[PDB]
Homo-oligomer: 336 residues x 3
């Protein structure tokens, strides 16, 4: 028996709070030079169907810091297209590593992997969502709360394209009872299915959501968040096309930040295209927190790995009598 | 001085029994949550000239579990003179494995390296598969039968895995059959090596295209039909040679016997060498077999490194002196 | 605050002696089976823009031996769409130390300038400083009977490769006598020679760049490298034979002309039958495989030095460490 981390839709507000608290406590230990060896001798399979810097390095570093090891399985090493291949691969890998992550081209691949594997599976980004980004961004907002405001009192505005990161930000903010806005142009907004999921979250949490092309919607934002304009890895929009759609209205510049408010913080999942979605002035300015945010990709990944492996061990406990017997038998064999 | 693991031809029945016993004891420790740190701070160079999932992940995981680390050197990263590469790597890692296109490459690597070398599969044999398969057969012995009483039938192409299965089964005193079509059977040189094994072990071997040869099998084993990595047989060509006679289906399993277990080294081509019904059925053990790739690799790594240390022992007086000198240097 | 290792030009003779002594003491500990865990739980990002065997394996092995881990990044992470500043800031939050083998020297200079963690040059088109330290360790271990380091003559034969220049830089820094024996159009240039001259004004060493075959006479170490030039733009076999063969082939005649006790060095890989003959590279006076081993020797010393420097400049607060450890333990004991 295992638990997966494919979407925050299967996690409650209270569970997300626990993950944040766990992640931040591990962070404070490591920041002061204590590395808790919570994944000693454990192996993570890391399946990447696309390129990655932040996610890949975070997983590999996290495993080392916690006493285990991450194995990088590059694009083309593992095919996740067809159910039959995915079932066989899942069953082989489940016997060979303790935990799995995958960054996939199509969301059904990560859903299928999690369904077939008997070990925990983590979504490292798909075309649909990006749940490790969600947890990292939540950690970051908690660390940068406005003076005298609670999390649920905050307004978070995503500017631009309806990327998987846009949707994921909507999912986590509404799950935590916050106020979310997607400020984006017609034809590039979160769709009806996206909005129904955000509505369902708000019906439980007391938060709110709005999807609009009204420029005034940035006003009062505590966090202003953006992402690239070129769309999906496999099928990018050209420079000329994306400028036509988004520029200059959706460029996060100092004017937009000032319209949001003097204390509004700037966030971006990275990598950023400077001179497009954001200007140098904003991303390098005093109210940019996007490099703290990048660090918190590692923060959240450490907490997730520990949570999922602790869950696995609680559901599949070791028998300490048989452990002692097995250790003694091995030692006797190697001595005699 | 070192020892290598290039072929089971250089290992006795007693040595293979020791490797099985070591592998299974490590397995039982880890299964119950004790990870023996027998390779602490040791580095394994992993040279892959061809793709791999099972072998590669097994080596990398094994090193982590035992307290060391495996370095994945992907296809094209290391050109394989072989003498120069061997001498360089021998100074930079503690142990080496390689999956190679041509068997002479692994023989040359082992000859030139001054550290232990493990064959991760060649065009000739696949000795880590042999040990894993042996572990699996031991764990799944038929009720009231000894290993040497068992019959193992390989169906289909004369792959390096086919030959390797022949080598290990005959080495352990078992009864081996290659059921395959004319032009795709184990050759005269293969059979002479199997005969030599049987003269020592009291086992037997048979190579035949007679469909009745599966009868009485305790283990029925198969592999893909598309041949070597660098020169695959097309779908049309391989179906013409092997289908349907050599497809392991439920009819063939029933002909072998109600209790016959199904094995496959993986990956499998469902609908060719084996049907979904068989590979997913109650008598399939091929996923236990896949797990035992890691089982056997852990045992091999420990055996070879223990052997290396016995032949090249550490001087504890010089160790103590070196430690003190380093500590004084870093303090002062 | 950090220190980098991009060029030995920023290191004094006394600092290079310290690195040699540290490297050799770690070597003697490991040789006798004591692995000092000086980089426990630390992560090294290894950026390779080009192929490598010796350098790559040395870094990955060194990290394991010292209790940490090296992450191999293939042309996964590009130095492109995202600026060097942005990539440097992201990686600085995710690993503890960085190395890179780069096509163009400015890339490693920029990475070092922008990163807030130590950066090591794993070879560029300009220099190869880890090779320098490994070669120095090797010369120290193989000093001629009754000679001091500064009494030795080192002759590099052939093309003016980055290894040629680097050998010039380290030998002149240590007060030795350096010669580049190479043909017109393939010699160290005026800028190279000005840097060697500056080193010699401080050290009392000497340098010479010449196409005179008699310049090998009296050499204690004779060093060579391949003839095919840079990774991205190799010289053909026909072209390079025309330039270098047979005059610059290191054969037994040349070794005898240098001296009966002259040792042969080569950074590897070698093209047998071109720059060197089988007889020389496999002969009794070849030390190039000890030299190859000392790539690992020197890399271990460098990693320890740079991380010790980093920790001295950024010390852990032991009171806050104790508090963070306690809070984590309480959280894991009491919460769920
Ligand atoms: N919408 C963007 C999201 C990238 C998020 N970035 C990360 O996760 C950091 P990484 O890619 O370096 O791991 C896209 O589809 O590319
Ligand atoms: N005859 C087959 C044997 C494959 C063996 N499989 C394994 O070792 C599992 P892996 O390739 O994932 O490591 C062939 O030549 O392809
Ligand atoms: N002039 C040579 C220098 C190679 C140095 N070799 C090494 O550093 C060993 P490696 O490449 O295996 O890491 C060139 O430009 O290729
Ligand atoms: C088993 C036996 N102690 C050997 O070694
Ligand atoms: C040597 C010296 N203890 C350092 O610093
Ligand atoms: C997960 C969290 N401990 C709840 O319960
Ligand atoms: Ni690794």
């Amino acid at each position: 028996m295992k638990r997966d981390y494919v979407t925050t839709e299967t996690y409650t507000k209270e569970e997300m709070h626990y993950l944040v608290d766990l992640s931040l406590k591990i962070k404070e230990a490591i920041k002061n030079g204590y590395y808790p060896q919570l994944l000693k001798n454990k192996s993570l399979g890391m399946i990447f169907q696309q390129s990655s810097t932040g996610t890949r390095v975070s997983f590999e570093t996290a495993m080392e810091q916690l006493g285990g090891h991450g194995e990088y399985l590059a694009p083309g090493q593992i095919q996740l297209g067809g159910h039959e291949t995915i079932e066989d691969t899942s069953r082989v890998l489940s016997r060979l590593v303790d935990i799995l992550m995958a960054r996939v081209e199509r969301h059904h691949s990560i859903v299928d992997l999690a369904n077939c594997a008997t070990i925990p599976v983590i979504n490292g980004m798909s075309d649909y969502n990006h749940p490790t980004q969600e947890l990292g961004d939540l950690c970051t907002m908690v660390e940068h709360l406005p003076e005298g405001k609670k999390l649920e009192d905050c307004k978070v505005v995503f500017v631009g394209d309806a990327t998987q990161v846009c949707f994921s930000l909507g999912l986590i903010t509404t799950k935590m009872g916050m106020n979310f806005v997607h400020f984006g142009p017609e034809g590039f907004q979160l769709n009806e299915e996206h909005q129904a999921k955000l509505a369902k979250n708000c019906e439980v949490s007391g938060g709110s959501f709005l999807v609009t092309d009204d420029a005034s919607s940035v006003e009062g934002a505590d966090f202003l968040y953006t992402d690239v304009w070129y769309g999906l890895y496999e099928a990018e929009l050209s420079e000329e096309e994306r400028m036509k759609v988004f520029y200059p209205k959706y460029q996060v510049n100092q004017e937009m930040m000032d319209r949001a408010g003097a204390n509004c913080k700037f966030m971006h999942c990275l990598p950023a295209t400077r001179g497009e979605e954001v200007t140098d002035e904003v991303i390098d300015g005093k109210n940019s927190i996007c490099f703290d945010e990048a660090e918190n990709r590692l923060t959240s990944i450490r907490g997730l790995l520990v949570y999922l492996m602790n869950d696995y061990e609680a559901k599949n406990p070791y028998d300490l009598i048989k452990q002692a017997e097995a250790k003694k038998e091995l030692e006797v064999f190697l001595d005699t």
